């Protein structure tokens, strides 16, 4: 009650991302084989939706976990619409909640932005190895991390902008572009914006793909996730960094159809939308133009549930550059 | 150059508010008679732009005053435009700045959100004492701050989204409005938001009027502008508050032709937009119901460049209340 403005506003979000909704609720109806008479964990239920999700594909017992006091919402949602009986709501910590058993499978919305920027990852693993049986479903079963070139049109047009000040006021601010072009680019900090699809300069590269049924997961994550990225541009532009991005995988069921929740800007927007990287000042390249390079993912020194990114990096000609960047939290 | 974006945004916002731009331009214009030959002390200048416009109107000599560290954009736009012998950019703060002289009029920019949210009010009235000759000219001379019953639309929107989950859903959570209700009006906090023209229910009434050429406004603002007001709301609706805005107001030189920059949901949008006052629940409000009460503006107890607001009103039959709120700084 004290400021839940906040719980309301996450959650109407979450459930306005209508992209994001129905994936997990087709992903989830997808699996009505594996879910039948069967029982399922919902790690951070909040308003209960997905848990209702599963008693509508044929479980039998959902236990609904949540920590923050959406609980009481979850639970009166749950019994306003004759749930009781299958959905049970347990409040607390997902580490901490006492369950009368294991489940055969586990769903969860635990995505932050870039993926792990203060995500639910550790809780949902965790939740894994104490209450998921063995052999157990997963829902969504898998991520994976994207990497791109763009030509940032927003950017461009936010930078262009002191060059036609003289157009309506007669008073030219042309020369204010390389000061506001070097402080809008030299920045070290993660952009989570949305990108349109011609922002994209080249094929996107994977570089990260998370099993989450592997055991120590947990462990490669702290060490930090990444890799390599090698492309070519399609054409000429100018181009003002990097996008990044992720997708999650539900697995096929009965019908063996995966259903993949995409956060590409190729793909239907979400709240996600993209990390950018940006540069520290824009690089011209041709059709052809190779890029690459590694980006790592890490936990931040200060706090480690704050996202920060390694980028080495290669454009053309150019010498081979690196920037840290962290996400303002 | 230590995060400079902000110090971009803030000037990118600021130049591209047209309505505003253009009222300062056209209110310095209006006052050629005064201010040709004359000098003129720009306070807070930023990229120079109104120091500019004062030269355009035919000023000998303008002081742009510019404590951030944007006062070297400001120089460069001078001279790039060729006005380095009638603008001089002088860095650091206006209350400890050295001119060579007194001058003829100020021009300045303070206006904070609901006016007096961390303005420049007390940079300009300290600089119209110190530096502003008797009976010199000031731009603008005055403001005016008015008062409003309301019904917020997006607020509305908001609240009824809870009640259509279910039509794509198959999960019913109508008994969720309530707690959306009452957690996003129950709070204490002023919400900048820029409303409709149709969102207003009553004429609006004035009910402060700050004459900047008074000596001792510095005093007075200290104890709190603010007033009574009354008005009757035009037809049925439900009444979510009370909208607060400003305007300002520029002598009108030769032509007699006062110019007033609004930041009314009235007249043109402005980054301003207007400062939203929530009741903790609505009120259903009829043709001709009385609304009536007083409004405080004030320092914070904190930091006192922040705003308070004491709201005391009362609608049509209800019981008189009050509600303290203030902005999130
Ligand atoms: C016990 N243990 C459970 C794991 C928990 C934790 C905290 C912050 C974390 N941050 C990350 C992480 C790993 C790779 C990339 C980004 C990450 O978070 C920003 C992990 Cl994994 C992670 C795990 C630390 C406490
Ligand atoms: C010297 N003195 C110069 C004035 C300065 C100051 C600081 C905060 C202030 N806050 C306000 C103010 C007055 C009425 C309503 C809102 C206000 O600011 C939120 C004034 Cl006036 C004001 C003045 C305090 C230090
Ligand atoms: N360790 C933990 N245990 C239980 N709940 C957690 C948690 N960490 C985060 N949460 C909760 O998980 C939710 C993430 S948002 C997901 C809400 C809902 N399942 C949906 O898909 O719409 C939040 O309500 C948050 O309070
Ligand atoms: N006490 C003070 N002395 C000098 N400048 C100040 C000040 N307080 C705030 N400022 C500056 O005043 C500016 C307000 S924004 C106005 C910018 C410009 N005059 C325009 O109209 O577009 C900011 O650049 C801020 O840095």
Same mark, same amino acid.
């Given at each position: 009650?004290?400021?839940?403005?906040?719980?309301?506003?996450?959650?109407?979000?979450?459930?306005?991302?209508?992209? *994001? $909704?129905?994936?997990?609720?087709? !992903?989830? @109806?997808?699996?009505? #084989?594996?879910?039948?008479?069967?029982? /399922?964990?919902?790690?951070?239920?909040?308003?209960?939706?997905?848990?209702?999700?599963?008693?509508?594909?044929?479980?039998?017992?959902?236990?609904?976990?949540?920590?923050?006091?959406?609980?009481?919402?979850?639970?009166?949602?749950?019994?306003?619409?004759?749930?009781?009986?299958?959905?049970?709501?347990?409040?607390?910590?997902?580490?901490?909640?006492?369950?009368?058993?294991?489940?055969?499978?586990?769903?969860?919305?635990?995505?932050?932005?870039?993926?792990?920027?203060?995500?639910?990852?550790?809780?949902?693993?965790?939740? *894994? $190895?104490?209450?998921?049986?063995? !052999?157990? @479903?997963?829902?969504? #079963?898998?991520?994976?991390?994207?990497? /791109?070139?763009?030509?940032?049109?927003?950017?461009?047009?936010?930078?262009?902008?002191?060059?036609?000040?003289?157009?309506?006021?007669?008073?030219?601010?042309?020369?204010?572009?390389?000061?506001?072009?070097?402080?809008?680019?030299?920045?070290?900090?993660?952009?989570?914006?949305?990108?349109?699809?011609?922002?994209?300069?080249?094929?996107?590269?994977?570089?990260?793909?998370?099993?989450?049924?592997?055991?120590?997961?947990?462990?490669?994550?702290?060490?930090?996730?990444?890799?390599?990225?090698?492309?070519?541009?399609?054409?000429?532009?100018?181009?003002?960094?990097?996008?990044?991005?992720?997708?999650?995988?539900?697995?096929?069921?009965?019908?063996?159809?995966?259903?993949?929740?995409?956060?590409?800007?190729?793909?239907?927007?979400?709240?996600?939308?993209?990390?950018?990287?940006?540069?520290?000042?824009?690089?011209?390249?041709?059709?052809?133009?190779?890029?690459?390079?590694?980006?790592?993912?890490?936990?931040?020194?200060?706090?480690?549930?704050?996202?920060?990114?390694?980028?080495?990096?290669?454009?053309?000609?150019?010498?081979?550059?690196?920037?840290?960047?962290?996400?303002?939290?």
């Amino acid at each position: 009650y004290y400021e839940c403005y906040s719980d309301v506003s996450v959650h109407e979000e979450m459930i306005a991302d209508r992209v *994001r $909704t129905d994936a997990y609720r087709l !992903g989830i @109806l997808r699996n009505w #084989a594996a879910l039948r008479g069967k029982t /399922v964990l919902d790690v951070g239920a909040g308003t209960g939706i997905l848990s209702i999700f599963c008693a509508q594909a044929g479980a039998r017992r959902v236990y609904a976990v949540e920590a923050s006091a959406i609980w009481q919402q979850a639970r009166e949602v749950v019994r306003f619409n004759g749930l009781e009986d299958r959905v049970h709501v347990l409040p607390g910590p997902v580490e901490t909640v006492e369950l009368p058993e294991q489940v055969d499978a586990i769903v969860s919305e635990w995505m932050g932005y870039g993926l792990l920027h203060e995500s639910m990852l550790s809780s949902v693993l965790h939740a *894994r $190895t104490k209450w998921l049986k063995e !052999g157990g @479903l997963l829902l969504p #079963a898998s991520a994976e991390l994207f990497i /791109v070139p763009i030509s940032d049109q927003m950017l461009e047009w936010r930078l262009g902008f002191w060059s036609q000040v003289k157009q309506h006021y007669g008073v030219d601010m042309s020369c204010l572009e390389g000061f506001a072009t070097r402080c809008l680019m030299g920045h070290s900090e993660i952009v989570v914006q949305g990108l349109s699809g011609e922002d994209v300069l080249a094929r996107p590269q994977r570089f990260a793909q998370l099993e989450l049924s592997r055991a120590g997961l947990e462990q490669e994550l702290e060490a930090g996730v990444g890799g390599r990225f090698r492309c070519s541009c399609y054409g000429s532009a100018p181009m003002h960094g990097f996008a990044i991005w992720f997708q999650v995988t539900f697995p096929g069921g009965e019908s063996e159809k995966p259903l993949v929740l995409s956060t590409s800007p190729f793909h239907p927007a979400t709240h996600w939308k993209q990390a950018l990287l940006y540069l520290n000042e824009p690089v011209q390249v041709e059709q052809d133009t190779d890029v690459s390079g590694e980006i790592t993912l890490l936990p931040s020194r200060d706090n480690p549930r704050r996202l920060r990114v390694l980028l080495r990096y290669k454009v053309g000609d150019q010498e081979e550059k690196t920037k840290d960047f962290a996400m303002e939290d």
